[PDB]
Amino acid sequence: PIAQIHILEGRSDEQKETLIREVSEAISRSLDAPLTSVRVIITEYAKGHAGIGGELA
Amino acid sequence: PIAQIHILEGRSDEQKETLIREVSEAISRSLDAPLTSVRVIITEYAKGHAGIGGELA
Amino acid sequence: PIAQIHILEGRSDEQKETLIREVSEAISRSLDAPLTSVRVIITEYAKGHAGIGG
Amino acid sequence: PIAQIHILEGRSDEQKETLIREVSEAISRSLDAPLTSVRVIITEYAKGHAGIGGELA
Amino acid sequence: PIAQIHILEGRSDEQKETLIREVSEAISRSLDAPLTSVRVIITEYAKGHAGIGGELA
Amino acid sequence: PIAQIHILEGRSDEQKETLIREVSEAISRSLDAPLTSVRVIITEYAKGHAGIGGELA
């Protein structure tokens, strides 16, 4: 299983590594899939690259 | 935050509902963002649409 | 420019055709890019495949 | 509704802000969906990262 | 490496198996990366879900 | 056809140009599609943005 996670930039390396672990575990638990088979890639977005309702976040 | 989860098909409806909640939950925790801001979309793949070594799965 | 639009299923052929038209125009106009260079792909999601906050 | 938009780098913030807004409205009108439910994320690509026909764009 | 390939529907299983192999080999060869580390996932699009210039392809 | 290729950062422009071409050739070859219709976009990921099993690379 492969997860692409789109988040706004500004988080620390530690916060994002925690994100990777917990999401991977969340994926593994929900599916009864081996944790080792879980892949996560993070994509960050600058504020001028993210919209909610036609307006920037 | 937006999470795209790519999985092989064949798993049950409830697992995918659990997947959505817990991934949503894990992201909210890791980033301390409101759950309402978290969106999860699942894409399933038939065996002929997935490769790992140039070979199907 | 490439736009991938993720939507919940249930929309009409006309709405999704209109979506392609209007999004393409918006991209071309906003960026001053040639319309012919704009590609849009639509992906539908059954409700059980799309989630908000749980 | 979620729109991921891939564009070549080199545009100004104002153009990309117009892009997010104008695209979001277009999605809202076309689908009869609430504007606030429309999400747009922009990804920029350097010239060496985009190909059209095996050749860089 | 992860490759998402978006194509119009209508191809045979065998063509798409070839797609997975040939692309995976190309990724492995171009990058000098182990073939086993290369993942390919295919997404198909009906003609009404794909546009080239605001018009269906 | 549209190919998004996710790779770890650190490669030179020349290798990634080779990646784009060979992947483009493989796609055209596999599907019997005109090369000019093949689009490839590369997205790079820093080491802290990629996880395999809850852990970084």
Residue numbers in the entry:
A (entry chain F), B (entry chain E), D (entry chain D), E (entry chain B), F (entry chain A): 1 to 57
C (entry chain C): 1 to 54
Would you copy out the relevant sentences from the publication that reported this structure?
To obtain insight into the structural consequences of the M45Y and F50A mutations, we determined crystal structures of mutant M45Y/F50A in an unliganded state and in complex with substrate trans-β-nitrostyrene (5a) at 2.7 and 2.3 Å resolution, respectively. Combined with the replacement of the bulky Phe-50 with an alanine, the M45Y mutation results in a significant opening and enlargement of the hydrophobic pocket near Pro-1. This enlarged pocket in the M45Y/F50A mutant is able to accommodate the phenyl group of 5a, as revealed in the crystal structure of mutant M45Y/F50A complexed with this substrate. The phenyl group of 5a makes van der Waals contacts with residues Pro-1, His-6, Ile-7, Leu-8 and Ile-41 in the hydrophobic pocket, whereas the nitro group is in van der Waals contact with Ser-37 and forms a salt bridge with the guanidinium group of Arg-39. The central ethylene group of 5a is only ∼3 Å away from the amino group of Pro-1. The observed binding mode of 5a in the structure of mutant M45Y/F50A is not possible in the wild-type 4-OT structure, due to steric hindrance by the Phe-50 and Met-45 residues. In conclusion, our results reveal that the two mutations (M45Y and F50A) unexpectedly created a new substrate-binding pocket. This active-site remodelling is most probably responsible for the observed differences in activity and enantioselectivity between mutant and wild-type 4-OT. The electron density for bound 5a does not indicate a preference of this substrate to bind with an orientation relative to Pro-1 that is consistent with the formation of the (R)-product; the other orientation differing by a rotation of ∼180° around the longitudinal axis of the substrate molecule, and consistent with formation of the (S)-product, fits equally well. The progress curves of these reactions demonstrate that this mutant, in addition to inverted enantioselectivity, also has significantly enhanced ‘Michaelase' activity for the addition of 3 to 5a, as well as 4 to 5a when compared with wild-type 4-OT.
